[PDB]
């Protein structure tokens, strides 16, 4: 579904309408009058097999591999946990700087790109979302610090939705482990962290 006024093809995506406002004279009504919204659209330099730099989380400066565009704007990323310690994380594009090197441009990685995709087509935003009952259970124990931290870690572990993400993380990491590792300098590149030395200039250097 789309519209291409002036030759554009903006692509429409269904959107719910939940904001409610009291109407002028008698009742109330849903404020939004629309059923579709044009979809996110991403930068030209966002491909699946590309390596980006996490920029804002607790993994700032870490390098990661794009995994999937989640049809909600946000994209899934894996700085393969087995080499980098960066889990399957759903991050948005504008908090990422994507480099110019594809992980699948290496001749020994390019072979397993199909299996990469066939492992990645099954992640979705609902899996990344945090479910209400485990959120409630985590907030319950808030009413000595190491104990509650460990409890939070273990309940996150036993979340059923986290388990499938961990399984995908594990299998994709095992798939990408040896082939990445046998390229020593690239493996160190991924394992390293991106800093901003005072010798380099942001508006001069390229991503």
């Amino acid at each position: 579904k789309h519209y291409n006024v002036k030759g554009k093809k903006k692509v429409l995506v269904p959107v719910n309408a939940k904001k409610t406002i009291n109407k002028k004279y008698f009742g109330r009504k849903v404020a939004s009058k629309k059923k579709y919204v044009v979809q996110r659209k991403l930068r030209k330099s966002i491909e699946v097999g590309k390596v980006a730099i996490i920029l804002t989380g607790k993994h700032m400066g870490k390098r990661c591999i794009i995994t999937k565009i989640l049809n909600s704007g946000l994209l899934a990323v894996v700085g393969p946990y087995e080499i980098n310690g960066v889990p399957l994380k759903r991050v948005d594009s504008r908090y990422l700087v994507v480099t110019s090197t594809n992980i699948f441009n290496f001749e020994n990685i390019a072979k397993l790109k199909d299996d990469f995709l066939n492992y990645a087509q099954d992640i979705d935003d609902d899996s990344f979302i945090k479910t209400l009952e485990i959120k409630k259970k985590q907030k319950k124990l808030l009413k000595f610090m190491n104990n509650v931290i460990d409890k939070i870690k273990e309940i996150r572990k036993e979340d059923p939705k986290v388990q499938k993400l961990e399984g995908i993380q594990k299998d994709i990491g095992s798939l990408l482990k040896p082939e990445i590792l046998k390229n020593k300098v690239f493996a160190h590149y991924l394992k390293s962290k991106f800093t901003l030395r005072n010798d380099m200039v942001l508006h001069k250097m390229k991503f």
Binding site: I53, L55, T56, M60, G61, R94, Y95, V97, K193, F194, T195, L196, N198, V201, L202, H203
Partner: protein, 103 residues
């Protein structure tokens, strides 16, 4: 070593200003390595954090940040105008701001 940086350093100059008159809605910011309008245009739209310390704790922490945005360039020599959620106190003139790589 540790504590990665991934932001550009800036200095808070005065407000958006004329002689004998101030408009404390925009703050003038200087960039570490920008000296031209063309180069300053590169940073337009980036979030800028003014991080400063307080004498006593406020949320269990002694540090707080005022957020802002690089709105447009100022002059020909790579000075930018930034708009913050709250006006930057003139105590902060000459102080250091993070201008972050995101968005």
């Amino acid at each position: 070593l540790q504590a990665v940086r991934l932001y550009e350093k800036g200095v808070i100059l005065g407000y958006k200003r004329s002689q004998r008159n101030q408009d404390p809605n925009f703050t003038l910011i200087s960039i570490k390595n920008v000296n031209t309008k063309k180069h300053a245009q590169f940073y337009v739209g980036k979030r800028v954090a003014y991080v400063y310390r307080t004498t006593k704790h406020h949320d269990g922490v002694k540090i707080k940040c005022i957020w802002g945005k690089v709105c447009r360039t100022h002059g020909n020599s790579g000075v930018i105008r930034a708009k913050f959620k709250t006006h930057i106190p003139p105590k902060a003139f000459g102080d250091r701001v993070r201008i972050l790589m995101y968005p």
